[PDB]
Structures are given as structure tokens and as C-alpha cells.
Amino acid sequence: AMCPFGCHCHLRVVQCSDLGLKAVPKEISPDTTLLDLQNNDISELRKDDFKGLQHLYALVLVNNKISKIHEKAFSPLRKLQKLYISKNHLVEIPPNLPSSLVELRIHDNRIRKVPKGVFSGLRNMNCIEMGGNPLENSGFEPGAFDGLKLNYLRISEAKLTGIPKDLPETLNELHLDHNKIQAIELEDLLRYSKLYRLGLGHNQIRMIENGSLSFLPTLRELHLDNNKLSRVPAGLPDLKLLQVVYLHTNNITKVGVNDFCPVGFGVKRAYYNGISLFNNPVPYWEVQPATFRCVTDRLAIQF
Amino acid sequence: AMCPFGCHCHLRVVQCSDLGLKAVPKEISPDTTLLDLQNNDISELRKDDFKGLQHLYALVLVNNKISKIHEKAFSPLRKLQKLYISKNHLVEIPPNLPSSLVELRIHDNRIRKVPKGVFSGLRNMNCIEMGGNPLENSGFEPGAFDGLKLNYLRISEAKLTGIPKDLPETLNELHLDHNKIQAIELEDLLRYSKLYRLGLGHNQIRMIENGSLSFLPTLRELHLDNNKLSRVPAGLPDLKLLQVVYLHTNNITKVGVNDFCPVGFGVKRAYYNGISLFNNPVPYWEVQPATFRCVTDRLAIQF
Ligand SMILES: *[C@@H]1O[C@H](CO)[C@@H](O)[C@H](O)[C@H]1NC(C)=O
């Protein structure tokens, strides 16, 4: 089967975008590897909508208005690894997705609660966009990300009121930027013991209670800007590899001299490679230079 | 350089999406081949915005608010073959796009005119999305597509009042659906002598002039639905390869018996593989059976 009317496709790639297609076209070669059918008018996925696309690797469904997805919709998709279904009217993480899947974009939707065994099948995940969704911490559910060894996860722009606890432990990155988070407590970041990044920018963090940032032996970048913070978060010096913390647009008033570098020189340590602080009530002349001894360049200090 | 904060990226693929970045991020490994940075807040492209991404193959800038693109902006892109910058505030077709480029999606923009030497450079195009722009026929300019052997071309959803005549002759597909096109006259499709499809759906074609559809020896699919037509366009039977004509939602009143099949049915000829007629003032009972002799099934006759 060559390709649907508006579409143009070449060598197993099928490009069907901005045609405003009522649903997934019926003429689609099985040879087909990518199906980019973005910004059309699909409102559901039907059992046999994707029938016999077993060689389909990446399906881009973004910018549609999907809202119902038939159970055995994805089941013919044996080799599928990429499923981008951002900016849709989805109302539940779709089930039965292809164990082959490694990336899952599902931003700007309408998912209010993520149940339990939803991700139970996948065993290759590692990327998961779920922001732009309206979920409150009470929407997650005991063992939602149960058995799911994945390294990236972003739940930005949602209705998070505090950092979730039962996420994947394997997580190498964790984002939660753009929420309504209240404050990072002691055992929040507990089990996330392998993180490189940790965005919490644009939140409402008022009081990060010390030692909580301790369980992140390897944390490398910490964005903690645009909050309601009042002093530099306690634990910063003890983080052997924190190379860029981000604190601008907070409500830091005072900057202790040992608020970043540690008291007695080490080497397990790393020199900061970026520190933000501008746009905080505390002028340049209130913070002794001795304060940024272990940063490298001057240029590393937005201030 | 490992990748920008919100971004995840693996094996030369940099995924920066929905982070709402103010601009194209600075830390981008030259090893990078896909640069997906969709739905952010990019407002312009700066000289050195992309410096040293010579292995960048496809760049995805869709759903951002771009409005100024520096001249030398794309020059660092020796091997770039896909550029999708649809859904942006662009005000003119960007110049000095990489000669390597094969596909250019520039939909939903604000480009009011396309001047002459714009595509002069490229020699590998074949896919151009320019719909969702506001351009009248007066907006094009003599020799705009000058020297541009390309095979696809979709100017949907614009302000076309008639079919443009100085498009690429090498054209295989050509879409002009959703316009305000008035009528397809004699020499309109003159030089497009190599088309397989020709969408003119959703227009205001009142009167397609005979012979005009004669210049398309190979035309295989012709949507011509959603217009002000009043009788089946003259010439249909003479198109040796027309397999699917769409006529629905028009204003076709009478259907001559030899409007579809030719008068002296050969052996070498073609069967229609689909004809639409539904939603037109003319009941199934006014149109003689002898009329669809050469169609194949009954089911190829939405009617
Ligand atoms: C900043 O003012 C103080 C720091 O002295 C802090 O307690 C408070 O949360 C901030 N004010 C508001 C409501 O933004």
C-alpha cells in the first residue's frame, strides 16, 4: 500500500502532518518504520487502526485530539520504540503499550490519576514525559511506577504539591519543575540515590530541610530557582559532585561563608562550575569573596 | 558537551521538548544528529546559535514563536536534510538554508510573500509544506520556485484565489486544498505535466474548464470535493490513469452517462478504484447504471 492522500513518504517513512485527518488513514505500507501524523484531527484509536505495522519503530501522534484508545490498539506494534502522544485529550495513561517502547511522550494531556500496573509490562522504558497534565499528588497511586527500571522522568507543569516518593529508584534524571511543591523534606529524595539532575525550579519551595539533599551522593546539577527559599539549602558543601546549583529568583536574604564550599579542603569534592544567585534580596557587597573559593571562573557565578 | 538541562538525549539524539526554553540552548554536542526542540519559547535564531553542529541532520523547531532568523544562522549546518519550523511567527521564507536540505516544513506561519531567489540555492528539496500561511496569489512572485526540481508541494490553507502557474514542473504531488480558488481554467495545470495527485478539496471552484485536466496525462488521484462544482468536470474519461476522483459535497446536479467511462471502452485502459458523489443534489436514481460501467466493485462508488 503506497501512502494516504495528503501524505508523502519515502523509504519506509510516512509523513502525514497538518492535513487535519479525521482518523489514521487506511492505506499504510507495512514496511513502514516512522509514522509522523502530527496536528490532524484523530479523536480515537481503533483496534485495527495500526494493523500489521509490526515494523513501526517511532509513532508521532502529537497535536491531535485523541480521547479514546481501544485496548488492542497498540498490540500489532511489536517493534515500536517511540510513542509521542503529546497535546491531546487523553484521560488515562494508555495500557498495553508495546514492551519494545523506550521513550513515551504524553505532555499536555488531561490525565488526572495514574493507577498501578499501568507500566507493569514495559521493561525498556527510560524516558517519560508526563507534564502539562493535571495531577495532584493524590492522583498517583501506590506502586504506579512499580517494577519499571527507567532513567529519565519528567512530571513538570502539573499539580504536584510535594515531591513524589514511590518513583523508580533507577532514575538518573528527575524533573518536577513548574509545580506547586511546598517544601523538600527529609525522606523525599530518599530512594532516588543515583541522580544526575534534579530540577525543582519554578516551585513554591519555602523550606528544604537539611540532610534531605544528602541521599544524592552523585547529584551533579541542582536547579532550585524560582522558589520561596529563605537561605542557601543545607547540605550543599557535603555533595561531593555538585557542579552547578541554581538559586536565582528566591528569597535568600543571607549567604553564610560556608554555604557552598566545605570547611576543610578535600578532593572527593568538585569545584562549582555554575552558581546563580542574582535576583535575591542580598547585594554583592554583603557576600564575602571567600564564599565562592571553590568555584572556578568568575564567569561561573551569575550574581 | 553533555546536553541542556530539561533535555534528555541518547546516542546523538538531543530531545529538548516542552521545556519552554527562552532560546536554543548553548550546551549541544557536535556529535548530535537530531535536535528536537519543539514547543519552547524560542524567539529568534542567532548567528552562532547552532555553531558547530555539522552533523545535525534534522532540526525540529516546531511550535515555538520564532520571528527573526539571523542570516548566517543555518550556515553551520552542512549536512542538515530536514528542517521543521511550522507553527511559528516567521514572516518570510528563511534564506541560506543548507543545500543538503530535502524536506522543509514551514506551516502555520505569517509569511505574506515569497520573493524570487529564495530557493535558488537548494538542489535537493522535494518536500515543501507552506500551508497555514496568509498569502494571496499576488504574494507569489515571478520565478519564486525558480530552479527547484522538487516533487511534493503543499500550499494548503492559504489565501489562494487561483491555481499558481510558475511552480516546479518536476512536481509529482501538489495540494492546494482549503483555499479560496475560484475556478480551474485552461492553462492552469499546463506545465504540471507529471502529477499523480492533485488535491483541490475545500475550495470555491465553480467551473473547471474543459481540456484543462488534459495536461495531466498520468493523474491517478484527484480530490475535487467540497466546491461549488455544478457538473462532473469535463475530461475525466480521457485521463488514462485516473483511478480515484472525489466529487462529494459539491453542487453537481446532473450526471451524464459518459462522464466517467470513455465512449469506446478498450483493453489497455483503467478502472476507477473509487468515486465519491454523496452530498450532491442528484439522487442515485437519476443517474443511469450504464454510467459506472468501467468502475470495478459497487463499493468503489460512495453514492
Ligand atoms: C521573602 O521575605 C521573607 C524573607 O525575609 C520570606 O520569609 C517570605 O516568604 C518572602 N515574601 C513573600 C511572601 O514572597
Ligand SMILES: *[C@@H]1O[C@H](CO)[C@@H](O)[C@H](O)[C@H]1NC(C)=O
Ligand atoms: C448550486 O445551484 C445552482 C445550480 O445551477 C448553481 O447555479 C449555484 O452556483 C449553486 N448554489 C450554491 C451556492 O450552492
